[PDB]
Each structure stands twice: as structure tokens, then as C-alpha cells.
């Protein structure tokens, strides 16, 4: 009738990504937009807005029946999973994400690191001169786990399609690992890896069997 499904997993970053954050003032050694972090502390965290904005785009191009043009108006078979501000049949979303926080600080200092992020030097060639525009970016360190929990809930009507809902969610998790997750990741910056993909119930109403 009403259950709570939480997809608890650990996102293992095998390659340092780069997501444009707010004000470019996290360090006095940069010149471009670094990575958004925590306003109170200073731990490299990834928001949840980049997860829904990337997973929905890469999934609506294989499970669709019409050429897209504008968001929230393509492929009705997956519009009920995210949300639609135009359809009168549903308005709220049944897939609540969460801002993943870096929880690898309990054993990172024991190995002896420099800080939490690094500055990578890059440039470009105009095919007429040597080095031009000596810019720089600030990526993330390697091996940094996170806390990703996908909250799922039914609303009574979710009856003759529960088995089909898990097929789209499970296929979307393995599809994100084969693509970059960030900004300007065409050169090889993103590529996540969901470690320990498990799902448990907290409210206690739906049995667990389709774990993997």
C-alpha cells in the first residue's frame, strides 16, 4: 500500500571529475570555477541537482517513443518517475535524491595526502602559435566514496507496474557508470562506479527479493 525503498550505495570515483560550482573563491590559487563544496566546512561534495539532470537525459533517449524538444514533455512511460508540471494525472515525484557527502575522511588522513583537491594545468593550441591562454582547473582526488540514497515510495496506484519500475532504475544505475558525470567530462573526467548496490526497507511494508 505504502512502502519506502531506499537504494543505499557507495559511489566510488575512479576518475577525478569537475563540476562548476558557485563563486570561484574556494581557494586563492585558482582563476576559474572550481567545485562546489560545503558552505560551513570545506569537504568536496557533489549536489543532487547534477544527478537528476544527467540520469534523466541519458535515459530518455532509449526509453522514448518521440523526438524530444522540451523537458517534462517526452516519453510518458518514464514521466511518472521524475515529475511533470503539465500532466494533470500526477505532479509530485516518487524518486527523491540526496546530496552525496564525502565520508572517506575516516581513513584518508592515515595514508598521508596533500589536501582534498588538486589544481590541474591545461592549455590549448590555436594551430598557428604555441601556448595560448594558460588557464587552469581544479579537479577532485581519486578514491572518494559518497553516500547515495535513492528514496522511493508508492502511492496505492503503484500496483501493476512495480516490477517494471525496478527495471528502469536498475538499468539507469549501470548506464551512468559508462558515461562522464560532471562538466566538460568529454576528455575523461566523470565515469562513476556504484559500489555495494543494495536496497533495504525502513518503514516495513514491501518484501525484498529483487536485490540484484
Amino acid at each position: 500500500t505504502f512502502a519506502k525503498i531506499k537504494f543505499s550505495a557507495q559511489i566510488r570515483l575512479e576518475t577525478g571529475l569537475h563540476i562548476g560550482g558557485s563563486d570561484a573563491f574556494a581557494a586563492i590559487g585558482a582563476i576559474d570555477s572550481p567545485v562546489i563544496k560545503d558552505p560551513i566546512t570545506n569537504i568536496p561534495i557533489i549536489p543532487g541537482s547534477s544527478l537528476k539532470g544527467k540520469m534523466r537525459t541519458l535515459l530518455a533517449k532509449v526509453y522514448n517513443e518521440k523526438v524530444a524538444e522540451k523537458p517534462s514533455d517526452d516519453s510518458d512511460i518514464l514521466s511518472r518517475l521524475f515529475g511533470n508540471s503539465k500532466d494533470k494525472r500526477f505532479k509530485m515525484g516518487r524518486l527523491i535524491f540526496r546530496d552525496a557527502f564525502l565520508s572517506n575522511a575516516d581513513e584518508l588522513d592515515s595514508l598521508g595526502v596533500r589536501s582534498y583537491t588538486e589544481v590541474k594545468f591545461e592549455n590549448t593550441i590555436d594551430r598557428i602559435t604555441a601556448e595560448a591562454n594558460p588557464r587552469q582547473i581544479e579537479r577532485a582526488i581519486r578514491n572518494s566514496t559518497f553516500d547515495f540514497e535513492l528514496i522511493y515510495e508508492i502511492t496505492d496506484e503503484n500496483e501493476n507496474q512495480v516490477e517494471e519500475d525496478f527495471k528502469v532504475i536498475r538499468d539507469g544505475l549501470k548506464l551512468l557508470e559508462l558515461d562522464y558525470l560532471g562538466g566538460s567530462g568529454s576528455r575523461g573526467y566523470g565515469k562513476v562506479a556504484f559500489e555495494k548496490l543494495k536496497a533495504t526497507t525502513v518503514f516495513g511494508n514491501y518484501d525484498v527479493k529483487t536485490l540484484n
Binding site: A27, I28, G29, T41, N42, S115, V119, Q136
Partner: protein
């Protein structure tokens, strides 16, 4: 802090600052990595980062002439010994950011 940083930095020698903002992109990030970690934990735990931070001002002053002339005038090595408290350490981090703003105010 900020009042004595506008007259001491201007008093130099030859014009046209040869040292750009690209060759100083390490000592400015190491000091910023200590101010944010000092508010989370205590001062008695970060005793290894303070010793490693002082060595950076010695190695950089033996490879470029544009480093020794700034440490002896701004008294960088002297402020690294007076610090001993968490509140005193936070003052040295804010003083380093003041020398960067006024550096690009007259040139670049």
C-alpha cells in the same frame, strides 16, 4: 594587518613586477588548506601541517630572487614562530590574502 600591508608592499626596488600570479600557485593553496581544517579539529592535531608549511617558504626562496625580497620585508618567517593558538593561526591566514590583493592593485 591590512593597514601596514598597503605601504610595505609598495616599497620595493625595480619597477614592473616580474613575479606573476602563476608561479605562486602552491603556497597560497597550502595556507588555505589549514584555515578550513583549523575550525573542524583542534590545534594539537595539525602539528604536522605547520612544520611542512614553513619549509615551503625556504625552498621557494632558494630558486627565485623574487621570493627572498618579499619574505625579509613582510617578515614571513617571523610570523610562523609567534603563532601557537588557534585564534592566532587564523590571523596569519587572513594576512596572506591581503598581500595578494594589493599585489595586483599596482601591476599584475
Amino acid at each position: 594587518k591590512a593597514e601596514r600591508a598597503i605601504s610595505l608592499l609598495e616599497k620595493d626596488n625595480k619597477g614592473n613586477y616580474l613575479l606573476t600570479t602563476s608561479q605562486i600557485r602552491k603556497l597560497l593553496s597550502l595556507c588555505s588548506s589549514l584555515y578550513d581544517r583549523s575550525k573542524e579539529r583542534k590545534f594539537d592535531e595539525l602539528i604536522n601541517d605547520v612544520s611542512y608549511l614553513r619549509v615551503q617558504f625556504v625552498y621557494q626562496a632558494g630558486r627565485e630572487i623574487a621570493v627572498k625580497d618579499l619574505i625579509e620585508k613582510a617578515q614571513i618567517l617571523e610570523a610562523l614562530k609567534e603563532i601557537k593558538d588557534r585564534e592566532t593561526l587564523q590571523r596569519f591566514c587572513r594576512y596572506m590574502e591581503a598581500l595578494v590583493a594589493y599585489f595586483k592593485f599596482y601591476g599584475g
